[PDB]
Design a protein around this nucleic acid. Structure first.
Ligand code: 96I
Ligand code: ZN
Ligand code: ZN
Length: 842
DNA sequence: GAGGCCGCCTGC
DNA sequence: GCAGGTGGCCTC
């Protein structure tokens, strides 16, 4: 019934390989595709490709199945094409009995004219199917949700009869994960030295720089005891009646939980212990390294980092031995004097670059000079930026050196004007993108302004962030919301991508984009991208991990054309508060992460509010002078970078909103200590700037949940403080220094923590919003010491904008332009990944 | 124009 | 329960 067709080709031990088999009425040769029924009868058929056929000594006939992945098993779920399969690195040996039937699976390769095949309608993009047999076009990575072009691994001249792509690639992954040694250097009594070693595809030689976890070694200087903050001191509960609402010790924006950055070492020795027979134990690789001091690691504490370059180190003669498996990555450490270029050009010339000019003696606590032995382009893509705003994303991409934004679409006129100011020679369209795309498809060459429309082949990269108004909820779809989505700017942006078919595609959005409508917006976006034939992936990034003193999580969808390489998500550059670095995404109870491996530490210290704005001169509430003096040189590395090389005699847009007299008094009465907000306000009468009076807040009702103060005073301010009682209007009090609504509804709003809250110099900004309001949702917008809200310039600094970047309109317009923009450092990290792909193209 | 006021859901 | 994520709309 089942037997071989022919004679043997290789009798290896207990198995005998054959090239073709016969089962019942059909024949199977290697390369065909088969189905296997799972143990649960209702589950769909498993599909695989047969890569080897043999017979076992004690089991029977066997074959090797390289499994396909059903489209619904991927992140696309039910949105997938019901007959589309994906290549995966899943395979196993299986008894030939399990084979159910032979199936026809074809590879739909993109044509040589793929870039001109776009133009299908949103209905086809969202829901259209191939309407053919089983087909596959992309290889799928299930842990990172990555769709990429199928790998081109070639067989051998001796292992082609039993060749499995999955087996070969898994062997490659294991071998690269193995840390190995290389060319031997010397044989000592105790160990064997080597010149080079390999780990995760990275080569480490003697003298190279190594990242190490902060726990790898300690410094000879003592970590002198910091005075731990005592418990909450008793306060005058009558003078500060709302202080009791601060019973939690969690401070928003604090960096006390931020992890330490990497230890930096220089490889002095690579060695392995010797077995008693003299042969080295190459499974136990050790490295002896020389210690580098960050400035904050010297006897001078954290303050030494305020002015120093973020990549400046001090050589030391201290040494430490660590396991080779503890190395987190390779880095370059150079003595600055013998450098073929200036230190700034070096620092900007590549990743993981550090320099040292002096040495540090921990015992002496002085800076001597290092010893003698311490010594030793592509064309830019023409880019279309849809929903550009003032141009933060385009600016970051340009800083990465990958793009010339030749066309921009921005419907809001002040932001369009700002983009024009910063990008002369770029065509900015203020029309509806649907109107522009319809004109292009109709065959127009110019819009009603005479501006030349981009055509197929002009757009080499497409980037943008589309708003998601009308379907920004977490609840499941219905007919109305789904119609609103398929008529939305997200779908319009996808249509732009389908029509122009650029080499690279970037969709940026708020974090919750990955979860909208039960992750259905994300699933449909990925489905459209796959339908076009694009390689694609998604992830969540924290902007603070790339050089800004701001927590800003954003959703990123990346797509690469066939024949290109799919970019990786950038590894974090700066350590950041872990609470703000939760980047995993749950889709259909499956947890997806990005390729990022830097979870515990990073190469650079976190950027703080001090780094962000310590150099800006003091201004008053309602400051309106558009052009003032810096009154001094930049103080931090961040300030030097954002001020730039050319001297800037004028500071621009250091202006703040003119808050009312009551709000100004409230801000003036917010304490300067970290974590201070409205709950620290004193309950006093104060005469305002306009001659009017701000009155005491009278506590008129009893809060059984919150109780009474130390003086027996009540804590409720309205009848609603009772169980079922409704708000009596007569209980509403006006013009109180402590705003009435905050204690009115504080019990169900986490006591409105952060409203009228001051920033912390050692801390970071909360998400920079379009309009700073102390009593809004994001109310922690007060200056650390000045009695005002943050300025436009301070918001731009929090976003990482260069000081020369031009804004347009009134102060609210400029605030909105800053708030709506992608931070240029984040954009630049993404662009650097894109450049890696550009340089690595086959 | 600006200021007061403040529901609903999710992840842990 | 705690923390985070979303402005908008009444009313003057
Ligand atoms: C925490 C501050 C707040 C916000 C905010 N940011 C809010 N934004 C929503 C709204 N404005 O509809 C909303 C707008 C657009 C998209 C999604 C949601 N709504 C609040 N609600 C509910 C409605 C309101 N009528 C009473 C209080 C509160 C509070 N507290
Ligand atoms: Zn295999
Ligand atoms: Zn009430």
């Amino acid at each position: 019934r089942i037997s071989w067709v022919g004679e043997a080709v290789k009798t290896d031990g207990k198995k005998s390989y054959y090239k073709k088999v016969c089962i019942d009425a059909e024949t199977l040769e290697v390369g065909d595709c088969v189905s296997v029924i799972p143990d649960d009868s209702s589950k769909p058929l498993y599909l695989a490709r047969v890569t080897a056929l043999w017979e076992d000594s004690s089991n029977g006939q066997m074959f090797h199945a390289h499994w396909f992945c059903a489209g619904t098993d991927t992140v696309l779920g039910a949105t997938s094409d019901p007959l589309e399969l994906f290549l995966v690195d899943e395979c196993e040996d299986m008894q030939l009995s399990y084979i159910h039937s032979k199936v026809k699976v074809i590879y739909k390769a993109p044509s040589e004219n793929w870039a001109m095949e776009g133009g299908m309608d949103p209905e086809s993009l969202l829901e259209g199917d191939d309407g053919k047999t089983y087909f596959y076009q992309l290889w799928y990575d299930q842990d990172y949700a990555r769709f990429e072009s199928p790998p081109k691994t070639q067989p051998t001249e001796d292992n082609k009869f039993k060749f499995c792509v999955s087996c070969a690639r898994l062997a490659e992954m294991r071998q690269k994960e193995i840390p190995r040694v290389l060319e031997q250097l010397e044989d000592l009594d105790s160990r064997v030295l080597y010149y080079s070693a390999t780990k995760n595809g990275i080569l480490y030689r003697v003298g190279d720089g190594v990242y190490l976890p902060p726990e790898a070694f300690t410094f000879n200087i003592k970590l002198s005891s910091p005075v731990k903050r005592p418990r909450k001191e008793p306060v005058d509960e009558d003078l500060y009646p709302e202080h009791y609402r601060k019973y939690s010790d969690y401070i928003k924006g604090s960096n006390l939980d931020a992890p330490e950055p990497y230890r930096i070492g220089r490889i002095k020795e690579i060695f392995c212990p010797k077995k008693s027979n003299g042969r080295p134990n190459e499974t136990d690789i050790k490295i002896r390294v020389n210690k580098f001091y960050r400035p904050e690691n010297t006897h001078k504490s954290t303050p030494a980092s305020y002015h120093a370059d973020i990549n400046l180190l001090y050589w030391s003669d201290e040494e430490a031995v660590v396991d080779f498996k503890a190395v987190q990555g390779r880095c370059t450490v150079e003595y600055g004097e013998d450098l073929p270029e200036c230190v700034q050009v070096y620092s900007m010339g590549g990743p993981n670059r550090f320099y040292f000019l002096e040495a540090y003696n921990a015992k002496s606590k002085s800076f001597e000079d290092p010893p003698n032995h311490a010594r030793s382009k592509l064309p830019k893509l023409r880019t279309l930026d849809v929903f550009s705003g003032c141009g933060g994303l385009s600016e970051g991409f340009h800083q990465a050196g990958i793009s010339d934004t030749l066309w921009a679409i921005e419907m809001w006129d002040p932001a369009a004007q700002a983009f024009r100011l910063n990008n002369p020679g770029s065509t900015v369209f203020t029309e509806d993108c649907n109107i522009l795309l319809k004109l292009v498809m109709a065959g127009e060459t110019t819009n009603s302004r005479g501006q030349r429309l981009p055509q197929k082949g002009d757009v080499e990269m497409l980037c943008g962030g589309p708003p998601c108004q009308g379907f920004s909820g977490m609840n499941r779809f219905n007919s109305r919301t789904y119609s609103k989505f398929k008529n939305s700017l997200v779908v319009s942006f996808l249509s732009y991508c389908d029509y122009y078919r650029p080499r690279f595609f970037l969709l940026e959005n708020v974090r919750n984009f990955v979860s909208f409508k039960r992750s259905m917006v994300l699933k449909l976006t990925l489905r459209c991208l796959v339908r076009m034939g694009y390689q694609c992936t998604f992830g969540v990034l924290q902007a603070g991990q790339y050089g800004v003193a701001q927590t800003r999580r954003r959703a990123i969808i990346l797509a690469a054309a066939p024949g290109e390489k799919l970019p990786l998500f950038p590894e974090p550059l700066h350590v950041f508060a872990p609470r703000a670095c939760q980047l995993s995404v749950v889709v259909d109870d499956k947890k997806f992460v990005s390729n990022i491996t830097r979870l515990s530490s990073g190469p650079f210290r976190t950027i703080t509010v001090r780094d962000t704005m310590s150099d800006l001169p003091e201004v008053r509430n309602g400051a309106s002078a558009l052009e003032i003096s810096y009154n001094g040189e930049p103080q931090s590395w961040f300030q030097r970078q954002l001020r730039g090389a050319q001297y800037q005699p004028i500071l621009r847009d250091h202006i703040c909103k003119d808050m009312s007299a009551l709000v100004a008094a409230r801000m003036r009465h917010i304490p300067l200590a970290p974590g201070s907000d409205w709950r620290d306000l004193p309950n006093i009468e104060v005469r305002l700037s306009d001659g009017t009076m701000a009155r005491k807040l009278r506590y008129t009702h009893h809060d059984r949940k919150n109780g009474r103060s130390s003086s027996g005073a009540l804590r409720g301010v309205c009848s609603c403080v009772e169980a079922g009682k409704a708000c009596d209007p007569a209980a509403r009090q006006f013009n109180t220094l402590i705003p009435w609504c905050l204690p009115h509804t504080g019990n169900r709003h986490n006591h409105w923590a952060g409203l009228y809250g001051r920033l912390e110099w050692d801390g970071f900004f909360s998400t920079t919003v379009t309009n700073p309001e102390p009593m809004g949702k994001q109310g922690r917008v007060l200056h650390p010491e000045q009695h005002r809200v943050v300025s436009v310039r301070e918001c731009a600094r929090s976003q990482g904008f260069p000081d020369t970047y031009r804004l347009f309109g009134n102060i609210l317009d400029k605030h909105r332009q800053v708030g709506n923009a992608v931070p240029p450092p984040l954009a630049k990290a993404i662009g650097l990944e894109i450049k890696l792909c550009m340089l690595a193209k086959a």
